[PDB]
Design an enzyme around this catalytic site. Structure first.
Site, PDB file in Angstrom:
ATOM      1  N   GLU A   1       0.858  -1.172   0.000  1.00  0.00           N
ATOM      2  CA  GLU A   1       0.000   0.000   0.000  1.00  0.00           C
ATOM      3  C   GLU A   1       0.899   1.229   0.000  1.00  0.00           C
ATOM      4  O   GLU A   1       2.123   1.091  -0.086  1.00  0.00           O
ATOM      5  CB  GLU A   1      -0.944  -0.024   1.206  1.00  0.00           C
TER       6      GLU A   1
ATOM      7  N   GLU B   1       4.312   1.688   1.664  1.00  0.00           N
ATOM      8  CA  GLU B   1       5.334   0.786   1.118  1.00  0.00           C
ATOM      9  C   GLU B   1       5.773  -0.329   2.061  1.00  0.00           C
ATOM     10  O   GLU B   1       6.943  -0.720   2.056  1.00  0.00           O
ATOM     11  CB  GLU B   1       6.561   1.601   0.720  1.00  0.00           C
TER      12      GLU B   1
END
Length: 674
Positions: free
Chosen positions: A425, A428
């Site tokens: 997401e 990271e």
């Protein structure tokens, strides 16, 4: 042309010196000429010039340039730690700075004027010394220049030359050379090894220059004494070149120019740019202009469109001096947001250049890598779906239907091949089904379908939209739990690992955060659902999530409210006295204060308090950091300026005036949230 004479009379001894570190990431200011010719960037921290970049925005060559004062008898104060610094810009429409450093013991005061030469690669610093107590002749002033050519403090070759009767301290590494000069020259010089026989160490023992080395290689410090009796006010110039002659010649040209002329030209160029931006019927404020210049100044001047995340090195104090530039990379996500600020401000050209940069990335990779160097080469290899979608959404808002074949179609096809799940997401760190990521995927495919239609590719158009509609209908079933331990148990979670948000599934939080069940973790990023027009601001699922988020990760600081990225976030200082080195405690993000404000607008409410909160979170230089402390709302040693946060402030500021979410793609909103 020029007459340069080099001499090696005395070489420094006992090298190569101790290892060094970068400067504090909390910046008082950042700047560069508002043109592509002058390829030099500078940053300010702790009352002194910190990192300086050349010839690209990801090539730091300097760690610091500071003043050291002594009475030649006892005390030896370092302005960067023994004096209080006050910063202010030349004007509200120029990235030129004035620094006033007042000795904590009230003995001296140093005032600086810093900016660059609009015509050539040189950094300028006018300075004047004032004796607050006693006489000026009772003080000694020394300048300590620490070169870290090509992103490394070790193995820096230092020496001294003379260009047209001008004594310049030189430094080099590979094809990068620096030349330090004085309009009044030096009363003495010395190139020593860090923590061995450098100017700072020499003063701690003698409180006056004892060594006068003119050669050294390693972790060096180029020191020099300023002849105060000759003039308490002088001009220091640092030039760059790919050779000794170039650097020296450039320094001579800058020095030969009239100070006020150079300064005014620097200011005028920046003012010209500010006046090209929307002023919102005279409502545009200082932070708005400050933010826009900072963004404008964050583009590489060779690889146009390449906007970096932050012109700093977070927790640099604790970072070893070799090869550092984590935030000096290009992220599709950050670039997207920065582009949206440029759009909102009226600088469409800058947004298009950033889009064209991304088009170049897709041409060479067939997709968007986690991040890339400013050159466009891939760096990290994480797979972030939101990053594949954003460039498509931007193409739509800029009405760049000409990029369908080279940008939109390849990214849209790539997303349909691997989505809706993502490798990671936006933080990271973890993969799975993320409401924020899925929101980006739905918006991106919807915009892709629109662009496909403009290109009369009805087959792809239908394919993209059908997928978007399907994933949009699955967001709730994949990420909305009704069996969570928090509050009433109903809310969107940060990310689901399986196809059932009610099931048990343990996840590993990055940065030593720990192991928890997916349902225990909430993240304000879910608001991306409304921001992108995928979900309605008044959707009861959104409201339910809001309750859990505010009950668990909202903090009302004395500067206003802010939120953590998610529960148990470890990306930040472990304690008030320790720097982040991999495992600590995530703090508050003014970025999230801005995002909440944007949601509030979508909800038809006043967002002024969120605008005001972001303003107070900014420091004296108008710079907003990535993170701030919960108790004081003051900046941590996290990255700053965080370009995405400044972009968010610009968009929020403008949105709060128009009374609408200025960066939301209308076709997405009309199809799902209208």
């Amino acid at each position: 042309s020029i007459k340069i004479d080099r001499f090696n009379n005395i070489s420094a001894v006992n090298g190569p010196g101790e290892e060094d570190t970068w400067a504090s990431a909390q910046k008082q200011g950042v700047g560069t000429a508002n043109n592509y010719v002058s390829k030099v960037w500078f940053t300010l921290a702790n009352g002194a010039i910190s990192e300086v970049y050349y010839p690209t925005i990801d090539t730091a060559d300097v760690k610091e340039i500071k003043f050291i004062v002594t009475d030649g008898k006892s005390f030896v104060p370092d302005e960067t730690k023994d004096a209080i610094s006050k910063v202010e810009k030349f004007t509200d429409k120029s990235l030129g700075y004035k620094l006033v450093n007042t000795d904590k013991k009230g003995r001296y005061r140093i005032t600086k004027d810093i900016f660059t030469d609009v015509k050539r690669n040189s950094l300028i610093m006018k300075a004047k010394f004032e004796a607050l107590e006693g006489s000026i002749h009772d003080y000694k002033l020394y300048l300590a220049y620490d070169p870290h050519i090509k992103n490394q403090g070790s193995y820096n070759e230092g020496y001294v030359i003379k260009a047209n009767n001008n004594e310049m301290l030189m430094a080099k590494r590979d094809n990068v050379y620096t030349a330090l000069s004085s309009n009044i020259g030096w009363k003495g010089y010395s190139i020593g090894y860090y923590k061995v026989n450098d100017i700072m160490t020499d003063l701690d023992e003698n409180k006056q220059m004892t060594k006068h080395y003119d050669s050294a290689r390693g972790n060096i410090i180029e020191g020099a004494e300023i002849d105060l009796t000759k003039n308490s006010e002088f001009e220091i110039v640092l030039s760059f070149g790919q050779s000794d002659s170039e650097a020296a010649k450039t320094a001579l040209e800058t020095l030969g120019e009239d100070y006020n002329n150079l300064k005014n030209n620097y200011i005028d160029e920046w003012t010209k740019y500010c006046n090209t931006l929307n002023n919102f019927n005279g409502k545009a404020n200082s932070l708005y202009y400050n933010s826009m210049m900072i963004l404008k100044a964050s583009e590489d001047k060779t690889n146009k469109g390449a906007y970096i995340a932050s012109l700093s090195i977070p927790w640099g104090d604790g970072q070893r001096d070799d090869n550092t530039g984590g935030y000096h990379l290009v992220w599709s996500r950050d670039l997207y947001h920065v582009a949206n600020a440029f759009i909102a401000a009226g600088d469409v050209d800058s947004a298009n250049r950033s889009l064209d940069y991304l088009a170049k990335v897709v041409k060479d990779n067939g997709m968007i890598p986690q991040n890339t160097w400013i050159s466009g080469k891939p760096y990290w290899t994480g797979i972030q779906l939101d990053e594949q979608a954003d460039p498509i959404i931007l193409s739509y808002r800029l009405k760049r239907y000409d990029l369908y074949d080279s940008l939109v179609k390849p990214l849209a096809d790539f997303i349909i091949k691997i989505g809706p799940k993502t490798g990671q997401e936006r933080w990271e760190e973890i993969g799975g089904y993320s409401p924020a990521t899925m929101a980006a995927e739905v918006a991106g495919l919807t915009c892709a379908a629109y662009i496909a239609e403009q290109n009369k590719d009805y087959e792809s158009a239908q394919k993209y939209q059908e997928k978007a509609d399907n994933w949009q209908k699955l967001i709730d079933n994949l990420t909305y739990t009704e069996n969570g331990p928090l509050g009433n148990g109903q809310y969107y979670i940060r990310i689901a690992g399986l196809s059932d948000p009610d099931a048990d599934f343990m996840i590993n939080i990055a940065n030593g955060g720990g192991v928890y069940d997916q349902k225990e973790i909430v993240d304000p990023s879910f608001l991306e659902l409304v921001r992108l027009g995928v979900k309605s601001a008044d959707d009861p699922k959104i409201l339910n999530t809001l309750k859990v988020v505010d009950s668990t990760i909202k903090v009302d600081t004395p500067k206003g409210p802010s939120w953590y990225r998610y529960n148990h976030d470890g990306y930040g200082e472990p304690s008030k006295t320790e720097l982040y080195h991999g495992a600590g405690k995530g703090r508050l993000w003014p970025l999230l204060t801005g995002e909440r404000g944007m949601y509030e607008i979508a909800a038809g409410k006043d967002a002024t308090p969120y605008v005001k909160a972001m303003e107070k979170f900014a420091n004296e230089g108008g710079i907003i950091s990535e993170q701030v402390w919960e108790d004081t709302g003051l900046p941590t040693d996290s990255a700053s300026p965080l370009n995405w946060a400044h972009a968010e402030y610009v968009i929020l500021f403008a949105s709060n005036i128009e009374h609408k979410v200025l960066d939301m793609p209308d076709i997405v909103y009309k199809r799902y949230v209208a």
